[model samples]
Target: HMRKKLKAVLFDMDGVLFNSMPYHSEAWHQVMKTHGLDLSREEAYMHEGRTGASTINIVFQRELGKEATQEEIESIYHEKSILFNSYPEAERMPGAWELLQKVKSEGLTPMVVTGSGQLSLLERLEHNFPGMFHKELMVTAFDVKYGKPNPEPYLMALKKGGLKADEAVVIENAPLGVEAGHKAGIFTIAVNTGPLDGQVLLDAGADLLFPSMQTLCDSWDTIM
Candidate 1:
């Protein structure tokens, strides 16, 4: 396959940049039960990289045969956010720093394209990545009407970064994120950081797959 000169890399948040899926999963699971919803801790991983509304709406539409009202979605996610914040902050994923440094050194614009809208978590980006991303270079839930599996978020990031589909790669950990990037016609790499099987990501359209960020970073040169 022909490859364009890579100009940028889009990074997902939950499992890709931070090993925070456990926190997110646990919070969502508990919150769902409180609301009479049925999102299991492990099943929640499959919903990673989606907007809060999208997440809530799916469960509602599926289980109740009705879309959620805005207030209901808001309340559930707001409660989940509170629980997520109450937990000790999640740590950055191992190898993410090294991989980022490599991307920076190679002159590749690294853009944060995530479904997360939590302000506290957003602040962690600067505290950790530190000057790696500016407002324009990041595409979060606020920047798009739709989230993962819709491709709008990834497409927005490419446009925000002034990139063509082939000019950037997406680093994602969730199947939904992979589908989003693939739908946008971008080459996507999946790092299986969660408990789900790797084939789930492959079936979601990951062009490349790695067991972890460390392996991905180690193979970056060769993959390029």
Candidate 2:
């Protein structure tokens, strides 16, 4: 029997909290095409959940027919960020707000720990998803050297929130995020909002999987 006690919840931005995967892919595709490369949406999804620089260096460069210098990679990455930002109003994943509100209602501090910059994440939270959360509870890639799959990002957020692994639930839409949460010993809940398959998230060590936050919201207490 699992205890129904959790102090905090850390959410990922791109695929988990918002339905921005397609928009991200569109931005990447536009930037890559400018460099004489082409990629499909599914290909772009494979790069989802990764750092912008990493995505630029790996997927974009690998398909570009030439090695991309770090300078070139960063330039393209910035370009894609600009393009993606142009569509910052992308719709939130269905039921995203309700879930966050419910997490708040349950007295669990809801925080975001994402690979995106802190400012960008806050901008989205403020302008894009107003009344969705408190920005003070967030931790971004800007705050740590280690990203997902390293267990540092989530651990950093938990520490900032004054929470313990057993006292937190991490809801993620990426395999690396799940890996990080699991390795950090937090309860991991995965939503199929990103490039990763549900089974992949499960194999990465998620405690529960949902097709959307809607499902989780519908079953929150039972799940917790």
Candidate 3:
């Protein structure tokens, strides 16, 4: 392995930045059930970091034995967004703001690499972290054909960040996200901010793991 230069920090949005995975899980379940599919909330969490279309198609393939049409995918995802927005607004994860500040202060460029294509959540990210992130630095579902645990999203993020795999670190909370980061050949940090077992992230190949973002922030100097 090469020495760490730390030129950029790639982030996963749902559980890593905003405490919003519950809303996403509920939205996925509600929409899928309404369409006669029974997607468990835990399975929804397992699908975290996958594009809405990919998630839907996975369910469709499993239940109906075929991929959904693009039109159907759009309809389901649109309804999922509606349900997500109907839930209470999600708050930032504890210490996430401080961690972002520290990363910027250390001269590392921070970028979001997510599976989300929801407009409301995108607007919320801009609102919550004004001037810290720009659209050019984000790798959303629109930018990638495949989603996590595929490495395409993170690889595109590195390209957008003008970084090599060894020049950046990826921060993620989901097991699939950790897998994606690892597949991208980057040093991956997993913050256990959700209910899943920490071993899941470890098994997914996280280079490091923290109990929470606050703990990660507290140990920033040592890690960096």
Best-fitting candidate, scored by lDDT: 3
Q: What is the C-alpha lDDT of each candidate?
A: 0.91, 0.77, 0.91
Q: Can you write out model 3's per-residue Cα lDDT over 1-224, one digit (the tens) per residue?
A: 33357788898999988999989998999999999998999999999999999999999998899989999998998899889999989989999999999998988888999999987887799788766788999999999898899999999998888899999999999998999999999999999988899999999999999999999999988884
Clashing pairs in 1: none
Clashes of 1: 0
TM-score of 2: 0.86
The C-alpha local distance difference test score for the whole of candidate 2 amounts to: 0.77
> Against the hidden true structure, what lDDT does model 3 obtain?
0.91
Where in model 3 is the C-alpha error above 4 Å?
1-4
Q: TM per model? A: 0.97, 0.86, 0.96
Cα shift from native, residue 208, model 1 (Å): 0.6
Per residue, candidate 2 scores C-alpha lDDT tens digits across 125-177 of 76655665665678775776657777888888888888888888888887877
Higher-scoring candidate on TM-score, 1 or 2: 1
Better candidate number, 1 or 2, judged by lDDT = 1
Displacement of the residue 42 alpha carbon in candidate 3, Å:
0.5
